Amino acid sequence: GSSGSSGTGEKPFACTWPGCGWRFSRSDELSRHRRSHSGVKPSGPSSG
């Protein structure tokens, strides 16, 4: 719209995948995203 962002607006967690440019203010928010891409997962026979 018109009103921009001044109060909040900071995401240190930036995706590692190449070309991608998704950032998150929280870690979990970034980890859950990484899923979208194909990469070695910390899980194997089981995961929560």
Closer by beta carbon to Zn ion, 13 or else 15? 15
Give whichever of 13 and 17 is closer to Zn ion, judged by the CB atom: 17
Residue 24, token pair as written in the block: 């998150």
| Contact residue for Zn ion among 13, 17, 23, 24 (CB under 5 A) | 17
CA distance 3 to 21: 23
For 1-48, where are the alpha helices, taking DSSP H only?
27-34
Cβ-based nearer residue to Zn ion, 18 or 47: 18
Given a contact cutoff of 8 angstroms between Cβ atoms, the answer to whether 47 and 29 are in contact is no
The footprint of Zn ion (CB under 5 A) covers: 15, 17, 20, 22
